[PDB]
């Protein structure tokens, strides 16, 4: 199966919301207003709060004042899969080796550097993708 | 091997030590050094640069461009009153601090050398006057009249083609080095400006002109004891 959190946020709105799909079925519906991982749950809530803070800092990272609908497909397929899209177009990906986001888009490097400024955020993403996502996938497969 | 005794001051990270250390990348090929213009080799070279002094620390006038402008005007009112008056110490004086000379001193604990205060006139070319700027050495009070100002060290600045006459204050310190911090001992004197003659302006010229003070350092200027600057006072992680 393939676990995929559909991270999404809007700079000028539900400011931030996650749609965790363990397979084609959706199992997690996180929202910024609630601040909790509404369908173990505490750790996922903390991780998604970190992701929400990263998305807010990414919104601050973009120089343009126009709307920005940031999206992402974070997860692991049992292999980590990180694909971030700005305004509905993929712009950056998280390199596991170098352990940092990037792409040809200038906004990709701006957001990657802004998230790198956050304390251990790149390694938080490394733990989330390489370790936390497969751990949650296996735990949910055994449980369900 | 060779008998060695661990002397006091061992296994310690002294912040001011010049000990050698193994390199992280041995035989690293550094990028060739190009002749980048502006090679600053001494911090006093930065201090020596005329730097506009926020003389006018008046509330509201600071955090603005009114802080640096000394308002010199054409009038009979308060012409026996100082144009400006502050303390000479670039370190702890609110006026001479937060500038190239002042912030340069704030990174140290002991300073020495003559300070040049270059007074640049910013007014109409038709404006003409005379401003008497005086450095009074410590021992007495701040000058309250131009008569008390001319007793000490003073320069009479004739507003004109140059209009950037500099009061290069002398080194009349009792000790070889003064204290950057607020120390009553070995403190500097006071800088007070007065109207030697009223700046007469034609009807077409503005009455209220301005003066910019530039704090710089001479070839005699030096500092001795390094310290962390009290200006920053970092609250926490950035």
């Amino acid at each position: 199966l393939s676990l995929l959190y559909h991270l999404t946020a809007v700079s000028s709105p539900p400011a931030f919301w996650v749609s965790g799909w363990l397979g084609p079925q959706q199992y997690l519906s996180y929202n910024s207003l609630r601040g909790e991982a509404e369908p173990y749950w505490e750790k996922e809530t903390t991780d998604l709060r970190i992701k929400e803070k990263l998305f807010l800092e990414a919104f601050k990272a973009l120089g343009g004042k126009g709307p920005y609908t940031l999206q992402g497909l974070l997860g692991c397929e049992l292999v980590p899969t990180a694909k971030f899209a700005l305004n509905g177009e993929e712009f950056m990906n998280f390199d596991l080796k170098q352990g940092t986001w990037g792409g040809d888009w200038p906004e990709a490097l701006a957001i990657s550097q802004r998230w790198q400024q956050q304390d251990k955020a790149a390694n938080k993403e490394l733990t989330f993708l390489l370790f936390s996502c497969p751990h949650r996938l296996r735990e949910h497969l055994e449980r369900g | 091997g060779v008998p060695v005794l661990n002397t006091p001051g061992s296994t310690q990270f002294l912040t001011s030590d010049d000990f050698q250390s193994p390199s992280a990348m041995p035989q690293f090929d550094e990028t060739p050094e190009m002749h980048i213009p502006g090679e600053v080799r001494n911090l006093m070279e930065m201090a020596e640069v005329d730097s506009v002094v926020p003389v006018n620390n008046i509330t509201g006038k600071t955090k603005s461009m009114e802080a640096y402008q000394i308002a010199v005007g054409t009038g009979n009112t308060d012409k026996t009153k100082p144009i400006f008056s502050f303390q000479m110490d670039p370190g702890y004086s609110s006026v001479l601090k937060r500038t190239l000379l002042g912030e340069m001193l704030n990174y140290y604990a002991h300073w020495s050398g003559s300070v040049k205060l270059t007074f640049l006139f910013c007014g109409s070319a038709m404006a003409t006057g005379k401003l008497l700027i005086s450095y009074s050495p410590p021992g007495a009070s701040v000058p309250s009249s131009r008569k008390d100002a001319m007793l000490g060290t003073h320069i009479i600045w004739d507003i004109g083609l140059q209009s950037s006459c500099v009061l290069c204050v002398p080194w009349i310190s009792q000790s070889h080095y003064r204290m950057v911090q607020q120390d009553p001992y070995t403190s500097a004197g006071y800088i007070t400006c007065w109207y030697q003659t009223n700046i007469v302006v034609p009807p077409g010229a503005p009455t209220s002109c301005d003066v910019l003070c530039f704090a710089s350092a001479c070839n005699d200027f030096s500092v001795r004891l390094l310290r962390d600057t009290p200006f920053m006072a970092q609250p926490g992680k950035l």
Partner: protein, 42 residues
């Protein structure tokens, strides 16, 4: 003190003894020499 115990040049000590300065870079940056005694302009 001058002896270097590591082959790497980056491993040497701080050049504290080196006192060099060119204040004319920043304090006298004008193209034409400005003499203190002489009037600066005209």
């Amino acid at each position: 003190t001058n002896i270097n115990f590591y082959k790497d040049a980056a491993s040497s000590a701080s050049n504290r003894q080196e006192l060099q300065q060119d204040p004319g870079k920043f304090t006298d940056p004008v193209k034409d020499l400005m003499v203190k005694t002489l009037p600066a302009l005209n």
